[model samples]
Target: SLIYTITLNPAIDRLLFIRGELEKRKTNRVIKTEFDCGGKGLHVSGVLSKFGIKNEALGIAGSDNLDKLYAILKEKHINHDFLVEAGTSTRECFVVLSDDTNGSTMIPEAGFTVSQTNKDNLLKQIAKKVKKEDMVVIAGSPPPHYTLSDFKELLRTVKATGAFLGCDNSGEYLNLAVEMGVDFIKPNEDEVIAILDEKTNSLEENIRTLAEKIPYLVVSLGAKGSICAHNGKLYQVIPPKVQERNDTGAGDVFVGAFIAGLAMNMPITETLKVATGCSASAVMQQDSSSFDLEAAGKLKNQVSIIQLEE
Candidate 1:
């Protein structure tokens, strides 16, 4: 059994932590800065690796910044093979955190576009690597310049292989993943609202609607924890309260740990517990995609999972 992750548009995340209100023309900062290289798929790969799961990460990289991004993955010991895009540079995301608000504002740039030839090569690469019982986790958004049809084509190609597909994406990508019938999907509360374009008052209703589209789905509820639906039964996995540092990659960590459990043939209840604990651990880390295994283990025992009534 093999686990593979794909991050189509990776980025260099520059996180700046500062305090006080913003002034239109005044200089701010003097707190701290942390840099990390990751997108959704890479984040998932990182968490999985932290839990001692060996996997490979696939994606497109810009020649200009390939070394830096590769260094980050290498430091984490994440196996990767990326196709180079010649013309444009990789994306950069700026995260500004204010101590007063305890919230982050992100300003990100769309990465380089993927050429048709390169896209075809990527699909061919996957066809060669994927086999039965393997799992492919595709996360993050494609470059804006690419059409949804092009993106769908990639999904179709991956589906042609016998590997299970786990999609962790947003907006149109999420909708397309649902339409194409992914094995598992993780959509936060806001994404669910956007996908339906309608209001739902309860989590149960949301999961019910999403369950119609996806065989298994997990809806992240920030501090409230997460709700999952499988086999027509919904379960709420709650975590013990802790002071959250940064929740940038909490959802991705949850997906990684959840799928790891599935790959190990763990019970759904225990898998949900691991996912919840991993997410909680991620929230306590300063880096974009990092967590403590020891903390995760301790938190697992404290997580509460409840089955909702139909």
Candidate 2:
């Protein structure tokens, strides 16, 4: 069985680190600048390759910066296929880092749009590449102008493959995945809260409620670590302390490592540790795709796990 990742809307992330305080209506000169490609599935594919896992990535590519994205996949030695289109850029995300603030301002551009023909091409590819028991992950949003039916069709094609489906999406998309059923899901606190629509002040209840609904579920709590529910048991994963640089794409890193752990057969506990440790290591770097496997090995031991009572 193999792993396949799908990303509909990818972006060229341009990071601007300012020297001093950021002020409105004033020139905030960036002392340093860097570029990286991001889309949750793309990030996961990169991380899996870094962890020495062989996986295939499928996605849409646009005119601008498609070369960069292709180069990145080639550099990582990742097997991939894309539906290339000209004219519009893939999309752009500007991350403004300030010396005065820990949080960065994110300005994202609307990505390229496609019609029924384009969607058909992608679905055809999915049908061709995927097989039963293979891990298939579909992350992020559908491209612009795509309707709920379109998204549902995409999900159905993957589902029909009988592959282990991993979904990282929100709102109606998440609802649809739930309606159709998925093997793995990792939703953040807000996404879980919104989807459940039960504003329980208790995180445990929320975790249990959704856990019962989905086979394997992990609730990301940022630096506080994550809680996972699987095989009728719950776990609280606590990561070691580290200097955090970029918070963006950390969740994707977690998903990638988690999927790798499953592929590598570390089972649940070790999988939980690997996911948190890799995420902790990824946060120390500014680039979303650049994660240190050596550091992840060391950090995994430090990750504590507590069995929770249901």
Candidate 3:
């Protein structure tokens, strides 16, 4: 099965590193910066490519940054199915990292306002090409003007064709999927907690409830490890401890690996290994565009997988 992805409001990630605090209302010190084509779905494509999986990335991009994004993908050899709109410029985002605490802040630019006709054109495009048995993974939040209904409609389109659908996002889209149902949902630790009732305790219970509606649930607990459940069966994977670094896009890489592994028909345990490896490797890389493939292979060999009972 081929894996396809959708990145709504994709951004060119510009990571800037600076030392010490900056003066209020003044220019900050100039530090080294790294740029990459980054968005949740794009991260998935990056990881899948490392695993030698054939895939394509889909997104809505505009004139300003689209050329740069296309260059990045072309350099990485990613296949693309993108929609270009007029009267809008592609979004750009910043990742400002504090050297003192190693904490990073995200600032995303508002971009890509589209007309109803633009969306209709996108759907017509998908209708002509999207097929069954293929995996369509859509991740990330839409821009302010865009509607989640667009993705819901996209899901219906993919499902109607019998394609495997996966969603890796948070807030309303995830909550809606729990109700509308899909093939899989992967959320990080905070998202797992956020989706549950205030009284909820165990993550296992929350995931169990989500699985009742969706076919699978994965909650990524950074550093601690990750969990995957399918058809009421659960798998727990513990990642090997390593020196931590920048963790940008770690969860996105995990989602990519999981989907790629499943598409390869690897066992659940091995899938966990690959997913965990992707995330672990992502931490060592500068951005989602590249991962430490050799490091991931080493970590995959060290993962301890445990089967869980209902």
lDDT of 3 by residue, 1-310 (tens): 5788888778888777777654458777758887777778887887788778999888788866578889977776778888887666778788776556443667878666866776777677667767887888888887666777876786677677778888887898887666667788887767766776535467787777666777767877767897778767887889987666668778888888889889899877888898888678777664444678788889888888887786
Whole-model lDDT, model 2: 0.84
lDDT of 1: 0.84
Residue 184 Cα positional deviation in candidate 1, in Å, after optimal superposition: 0.9
Off by over 4 Å in 1: 17-24, 29-33, 98-101, 193-206
Query: Candidate 3 regions off by >4 Å?
Result: 19-26, 98-103, 193-201
105-217 per-residue lDDT for model 1 (tens digits): 67898888788878888899899998877999999888767678878988888899978998988888888998888889888888887777768467578778879878768
* Model 1 RMSD in angstroms: 2.3
Q: Can you give the lDDT of residue 99 in candidate 3?
A: 58
User: What TM-score does prediction 2 earn?
Assistant: 0.92
By TM-score, the candidates rank as: 2, 1, 3
Go through the candidates in order and give each one's C-alpha lDDT: 0.84, 0.84, 0.77
Residue 135 CA displacement from its true place in model 1, Å: 0.4
**Cα shift from native, residue 143, model 2 (Å):** 2.6
Cα deviation of 289, candidate 3, in Å: 4.4
Which candidate wins on TM-score? 2
